[PDB]
Symmetry: C2
Subunit: 51 residues, 2 copies
């Protein structure tokens, strides 16, 4: 019993770390999405300007 | 000990999926900035040209 409970506890905390890291990469993705946005608006607007 | 074995099993299965989640968004992270790297060049040839 002692063995099993110890293994479970360490695995659970390791999980907590796992999903925090997943969150963090997710904000990475979203902020990069936003920058991609900002460019794409800028360059279509400059197409209208030149035209 | 049974539920100690039993409960440990799922968290392992939950974890392995939790490590799987690392790859794809980070894989998306590899593929996110290439499109940045793709999109940045897009204006470059244009504005040297349309000038």
């Amino acid at each position: 019993r002692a063995t099993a409970i110890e293994r479970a506890d360490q695995l659970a905390k390791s999980a907590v770390a796992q999903e925090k890291a997943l969150k963090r990469a997710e904000e990475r993705a979203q902020q990069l999405r936003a920058r991609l946005d900002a460019m794409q608006e800028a360059q279509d607007q400059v197409r209208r300007d030149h035209e």
